[PDB]
Amino acid sequence: AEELEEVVMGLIINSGQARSLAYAALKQAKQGDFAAAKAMMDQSRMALNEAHLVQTKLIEGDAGEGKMKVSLVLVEAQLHLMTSMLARELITELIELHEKLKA
Amino acid sequence: AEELEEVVMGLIINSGQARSLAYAALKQAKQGDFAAAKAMMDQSRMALNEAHLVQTKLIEGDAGEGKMKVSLVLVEAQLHLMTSMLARELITELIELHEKLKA
Amino acid sequence: AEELEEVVMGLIINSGQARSLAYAALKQAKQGDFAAAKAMMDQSRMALNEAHLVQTKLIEGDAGEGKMKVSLVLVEAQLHLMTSMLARELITELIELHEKLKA
Amino acid sequence: KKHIYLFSSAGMSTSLLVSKMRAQAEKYEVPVIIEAFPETLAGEKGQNADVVLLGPQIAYMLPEIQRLLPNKPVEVIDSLLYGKVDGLGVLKAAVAAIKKAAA
């Protein structure tokens, strides 16, 4: 719907940016730049946190014209957010490994 | 619906616990405790297996009031289970890497 | 529906094969076969690309009997594709780490 | 009661066929238990089936599944019967494979 639809687009974009930053963070690690990697992960987390917060509201007040039913876009939004959050967390672990690899 | 809805909550919680155990398993690896990591991974896998089995039934007998349509919560449940299973598998790989790192 | 449903099955299978190839690619890396790993990742990527392309069409012309509503299977298809694509990317990173581990 | 297990990395689509087969089995009092599973469980679950049926998307896997379950009749579901969701037709093919197997 109007906002919900536009909001989902924002969430999808936000989730996408989050992943983008995460991968970029990893790239920094490959260059041996732990400082920049750390900074990038932090920002990525904050982006996800804000996105997750918005989704939380979107789940607490789930729309849906019918009784129990909810906004269809919710699951779609969750899909992007869940994937991005998971990816970022794993990427964080990967970055930590790069640090252990000494490099 | 009654059970399906309560069942999904259980699945979501189960999936969440599974991931929690998986991350905990990884943490054990970081401490250099391969034994505890291995044990935690095994339990996580078993938890997912039981969760997946329940979902399998939920997909074979997909509800849905209308013709082809299915229970909406199914996809939601699948989202959590798919994410958790994937995360756990990747985490397992990450743990194996820690073992190769010697530490 | 007829095609959409059969198409989703193909996408799910394709996504599954993609992951299968990805894990196999990783396995090659563990055996110290970087050449085979690289080849497997490339094919896996191509498989996903074709799958993603098909999904793109499935999202641009989203069915749905009702107004705004879209094909339910779309999200299901996206779930498998998103998970598989993400898994491969992370697996690719994992393989690169194996290469850095020297082995 | 004989166990008819269907395998396909897409339970949702096969799940609809399973529900129609169960309806038919009830209508004609056929003593069978019908379950759908993803192809990943063909080796684990197949051991308990009286007949193993593969979805048409996984036909290429027939030789592998036959070697995995050398003591079980294994066959691919007719693609037309599958696409049309012919519960009675597939139920007939399954009972036939069982008879042709016991003699």
- Candidates B67, B61, A74, A48; CA nearest to C75 is A74
Round to whole Å and give the CA distance between D39 and D92.
22
CB contact under 8 A, B59 and D36: yes
Residue B93, amino acid: E
- The first and second tokens of residue B59, run together, are 């997909």
Task: Identify from B70, B75, B98 which residue to disrupt to test chain C contact, counting C C-beta atoms within 10 A and taking the largest count.
Answer: B75
What structural domains and CATH numbers belong to chain D? 1-103 (3.40.50.2300)
Check if the beta carbon of residue A83 is closer than 8 Å to that of residue A15: yes
Residue C28 Cα to chain centre, angstroms? 19
Check if the beta carbon of residue D48 is closer than 8 Å to that of residue C49: no
Helix (H, G, I), strand (E, B) or coil at C65: coil
- Candidates B12, B11, B7, B41; CA nearest to B26 is B41
- Candidates C86, C83, C71, C87; CA nearest to C8 is C71
DSSP bridge pairs for D4: D34, D51
CB contact under 8 A, B83 and A78: no
**DSSP conformational letter for C68:** S
Minimum Cα–Cα distance from C59: chain A residue: A76
For A84-101, give the DSSP string: HHHHHHHHHHHHHHHHHT
Q: Where are the alpha helices (DSSP H) in chain B?
A: 2-30, 34-60, 72-100
DSSP bridge pairs for D33: D3
Other residues' Cβ atoms within 10 Å of the Cβ of residue B91: 25
Check if the beta carbon of residue A16 is closer than 8 Å to that of residue A84: yes
Round to whole Å and give the CA distance between C7 and C54.
9
Task: Identify from C9, C73, C76, C79 which residue to disrupt to test chain D contact, counting D C-beta atoms within 10 A and taking the largest count.
Answer: C9
**A91 vs B contacts (CB less than 8 Å):** none
Helix (H, G, I), strand (E, B) or coil at B93: helix
Minimum Cα–Cα distance from A91: chain C residue: C90
Q: Where are the alpha helices (DSSP H) in A31-71?
A: 34-60
CB nearest D12 (choices: C10, C16, C76): C76
Round to whole Å and give the CA distance between D40 and B48.
14
What structural domains and CATH numbers belong to chain C? 1-103 (1.20.58.80)
C-alpha atoms less than 13 angstroms from C-alpha of B98 in its C-beta half-sphere: 23
**D55 vs C contacts (CB less than 8 Å):** 9
Q: How many CB pairs under 8 A join A and C?
A: 34
CA dist C82 → A45, A82, B28 (Å): 20, 10, 29
- The first and second tokens of residue B30, run together, are 């970081």
Residue A56, amino acid: T
Answer whether C69 touches A (CB < 8 Å).
yes
Round to whole Å and give the CA distance between A91 and A26.
7
CB contact under 8 A, D10 and C2: no
- Candidates D46, D35, D26, D38; CA nearest to D88 is D26
Shortest Cα distance from A103 to chain B (angstroms)? 13
Check if the beta carbon of residue D82 is closer than 8 Å to that of residue D55: yes
Round to whole Å and give the CA distance between A20 and A29.
14
Sheet holding D32-37, edge to edge: D32-37, D2-7, D51-54, D74-76
Residue B72 Cα to chain centre, angstroms? 19
Check if the beta carbon of residue C79 is closer than 8 Å to that of residue B78: yes
Q: If 0-12 CB within 10 Å is exposed, 13-18 middle and 19+ buried, where does residue B6 land?
A: exposed
Check if the beta carbon of residue A22 is closer than 8 Å to that of residue A89: no
CB contact under 8 A, C9 and D39: no
Q: Terminal CA-to-CA distance of chain B, rounded, Å?
A: 49
- The first and second tokens of residue B84, run together, are 């958790």
Q: Terminal CA-to-CA distance of chain A, rounded, Å?
A: 49
Answer whether B61 touches D (CB < 8 Å).
yes
Round to whole Å and give the CA distance between B66 and D16.
13
- Candidates C49, C55, C74, C79; CA nearest to C64 is C74
CB contact under 8 A, C12 and D10: yes
Q: Residue D78: which region, alpha, beta or left (left: phi > 0; alpha: psi -120 to 50)?
A: beta
- The first and second tokens of residue C15, run together, are 């996504």
C-alpha atoms less than 13 angstroms from C-alpha of D32 in its C-beta half-sphere: 28
Method: NMR
CB contact under 8 A, C91 and B86: no
CB contact under 8 A, D11 and B56: yes
